Amino acid sequence: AFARDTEVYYENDTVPHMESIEEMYSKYASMNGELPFDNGYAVPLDNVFVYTLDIASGEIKKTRASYIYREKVEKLIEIKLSSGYSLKVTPSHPVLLFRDGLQWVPAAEVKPGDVVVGVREEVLRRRIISKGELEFHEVSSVRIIDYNNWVYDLVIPETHNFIAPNGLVLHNAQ
């Protein structure tokens, strides 16, 4: 799962949306309602799509999300990038790393200086997106932090992975 402060990208009614995850959560929770879960709460979706990567052939495609989800955590990992951005995520959460191949590694096993997989985040926010490419990013530093707050997951039963507007590739995890 990821922090409520995180920026996100999605599409519905043939148009893109780009805002903080807590803002799209508050929109969908006001439209469709919030349902209970064992470990937290969930919001059901309809015709909501995101960019997803085929890890097998490295091909770019679009997939549906099933529901939004949230739960509570005290302990989170912050990973800083050479771009000046930071990824704030649970110690369990697999990130797409590069070591001779595309590999899913939990933030607790991520170390400073490793390669994160993504795409040009400026190109991802143009009117026409120059498709069929990817971009590698350097980890600046890592640390364990006290969040004590609600964290999200945006669920994809097709592939279990999606891309954020900041270019990075994410896996579904608690």
UniProtKB/Swiss-Prot annotation:
Transmembrane segments: none
Stated name of the protein: Pho RadA intein
